[PDB]
C-alpha positions as a Markdown table, in Angstrom:
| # | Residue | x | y | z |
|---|---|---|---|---|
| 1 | Unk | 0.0 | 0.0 | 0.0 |
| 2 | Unk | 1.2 | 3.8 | -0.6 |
| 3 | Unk | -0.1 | 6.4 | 1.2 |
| 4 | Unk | -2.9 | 8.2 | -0.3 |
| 5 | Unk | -4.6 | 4.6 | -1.1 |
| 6 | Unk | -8.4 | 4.4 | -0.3 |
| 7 | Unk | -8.7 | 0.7 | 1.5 |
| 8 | Unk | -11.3 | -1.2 | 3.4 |
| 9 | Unk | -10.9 | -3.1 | 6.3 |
| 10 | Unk | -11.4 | -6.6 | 6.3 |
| 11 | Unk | -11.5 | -7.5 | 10.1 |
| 12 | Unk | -11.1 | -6.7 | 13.5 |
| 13 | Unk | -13.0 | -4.4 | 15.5 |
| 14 | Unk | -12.8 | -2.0 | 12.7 |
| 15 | Unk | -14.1 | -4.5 | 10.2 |
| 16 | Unk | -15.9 | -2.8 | 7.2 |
| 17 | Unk | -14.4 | 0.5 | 7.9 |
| 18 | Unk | -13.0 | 2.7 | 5.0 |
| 19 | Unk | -10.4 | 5.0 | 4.7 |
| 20 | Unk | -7.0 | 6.3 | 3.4 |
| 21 | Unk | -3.0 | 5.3 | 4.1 |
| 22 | Unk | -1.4 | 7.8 | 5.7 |
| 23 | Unk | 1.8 | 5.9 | 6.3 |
| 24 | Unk | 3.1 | 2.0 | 5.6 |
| 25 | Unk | 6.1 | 0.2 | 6.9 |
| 26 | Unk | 6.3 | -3.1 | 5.6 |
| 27 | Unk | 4.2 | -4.7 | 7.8 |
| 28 | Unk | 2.3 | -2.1 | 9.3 |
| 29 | Unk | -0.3 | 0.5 | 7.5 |
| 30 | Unk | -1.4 | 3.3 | 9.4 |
| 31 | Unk | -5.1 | 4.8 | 8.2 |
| 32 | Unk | -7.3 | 7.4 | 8.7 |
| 33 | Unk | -10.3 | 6.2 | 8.5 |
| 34 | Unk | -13.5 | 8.2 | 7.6 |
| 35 | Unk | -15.0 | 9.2 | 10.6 |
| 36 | Unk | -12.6 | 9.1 | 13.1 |
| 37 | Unk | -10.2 | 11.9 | 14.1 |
| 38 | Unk | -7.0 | 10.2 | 14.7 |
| 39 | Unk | -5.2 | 7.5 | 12.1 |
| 40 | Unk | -4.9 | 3.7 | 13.4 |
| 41 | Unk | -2.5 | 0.8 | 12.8 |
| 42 | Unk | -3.2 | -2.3 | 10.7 |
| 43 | Unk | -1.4 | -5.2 | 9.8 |
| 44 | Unk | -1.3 | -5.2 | 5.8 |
| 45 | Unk | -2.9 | -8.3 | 5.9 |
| 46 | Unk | -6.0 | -7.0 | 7.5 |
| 47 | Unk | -6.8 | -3.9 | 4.4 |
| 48 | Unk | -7.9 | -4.4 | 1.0 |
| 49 | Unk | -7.7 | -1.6 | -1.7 |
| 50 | Unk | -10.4 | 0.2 | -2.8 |
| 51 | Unk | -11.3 | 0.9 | -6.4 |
| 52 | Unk | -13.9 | 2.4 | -8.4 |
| 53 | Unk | -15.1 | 2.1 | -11.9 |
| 54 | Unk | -13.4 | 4.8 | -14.0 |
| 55 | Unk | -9.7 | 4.1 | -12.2 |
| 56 | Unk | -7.3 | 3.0 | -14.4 |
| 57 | Unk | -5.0 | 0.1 | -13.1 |
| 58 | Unk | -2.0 | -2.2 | -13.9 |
| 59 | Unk | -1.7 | -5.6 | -12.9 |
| 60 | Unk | 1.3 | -5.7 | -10.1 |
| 61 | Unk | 1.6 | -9.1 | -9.0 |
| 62 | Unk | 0.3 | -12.9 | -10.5 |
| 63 | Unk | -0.4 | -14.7 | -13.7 |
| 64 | Unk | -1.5 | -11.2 | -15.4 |
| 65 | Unk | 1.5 | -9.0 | -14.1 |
| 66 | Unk | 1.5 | -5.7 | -16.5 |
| 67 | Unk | -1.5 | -6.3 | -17.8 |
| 68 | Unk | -3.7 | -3.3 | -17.7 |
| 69 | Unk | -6.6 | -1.0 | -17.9 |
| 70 | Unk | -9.9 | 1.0 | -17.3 |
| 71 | Unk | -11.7 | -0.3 | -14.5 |
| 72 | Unk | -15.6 | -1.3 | -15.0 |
| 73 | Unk | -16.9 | -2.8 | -12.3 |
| 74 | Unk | -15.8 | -3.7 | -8.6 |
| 75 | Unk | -17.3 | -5.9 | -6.7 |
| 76 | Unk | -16.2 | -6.9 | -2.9 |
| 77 | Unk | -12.9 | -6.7 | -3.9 |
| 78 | Unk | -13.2 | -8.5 | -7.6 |
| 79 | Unk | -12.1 | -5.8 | -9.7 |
| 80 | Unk | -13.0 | -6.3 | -13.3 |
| 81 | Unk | -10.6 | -3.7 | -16.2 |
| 82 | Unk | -11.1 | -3.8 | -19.9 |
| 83 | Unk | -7.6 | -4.6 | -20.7 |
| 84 | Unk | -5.4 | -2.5 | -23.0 |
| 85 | Unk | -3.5 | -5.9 | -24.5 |
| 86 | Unk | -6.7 | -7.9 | -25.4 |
| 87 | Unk | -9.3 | -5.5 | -25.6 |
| 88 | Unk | -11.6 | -8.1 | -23.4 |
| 89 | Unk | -12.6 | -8.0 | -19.8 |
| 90 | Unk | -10.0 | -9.4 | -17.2 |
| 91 | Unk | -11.0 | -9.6 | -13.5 |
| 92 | Unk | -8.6 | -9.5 | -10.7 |
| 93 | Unk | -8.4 | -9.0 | -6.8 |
| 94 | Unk | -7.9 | -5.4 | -6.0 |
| 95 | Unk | -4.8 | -5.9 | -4.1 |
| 96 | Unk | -2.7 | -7.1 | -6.7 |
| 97 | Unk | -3.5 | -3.6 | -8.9 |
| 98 | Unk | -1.7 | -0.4 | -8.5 |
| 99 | Unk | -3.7 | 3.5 | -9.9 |
């Protein structure tokens, strides 16, 4: 994650919040999330990213590393791009895409 990254988060007592990276150490993302007034601490493995149709993404990690494109539809972290190689729909979880 980089700061300025809208995520979601996926458990704990702040399960379902939203919100934005403000800092990341490898391990350790530290949001503000909408609502509250201070930033909090996450393990990365707790946060997924948020994206919206209209983003444009690449591919940053699996099978379809560098693919790429505009974004058409999100759904619960399913993130589905119109890809600028094949010019067909490819659908990937958000958290291996980069904006």
């Amino acid at each position: 994650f980089q700061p300025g990254d809208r995520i979601e988060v996926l458990n704990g007592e702040q399960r379902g919040s939203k919100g934005i990276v403000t800092r990341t150490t490898k391990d350790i993302a530290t949001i503000k999330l909408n609502g509250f007034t201070t930033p909090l601490e996450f393990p990365i493995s707790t946060l997924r990213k948020i994206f919206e149709p209209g983003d444009h993404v690449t591919v940053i990690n699996g099978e379809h590393q560098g693919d790429a494109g505009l974004v058409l539809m999100v759904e619960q972290g399913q993130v589905t791009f119109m890809s600028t190689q094949t010019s067909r729909e490819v659908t990937i979880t958000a958290n291996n895409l980069s904006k």
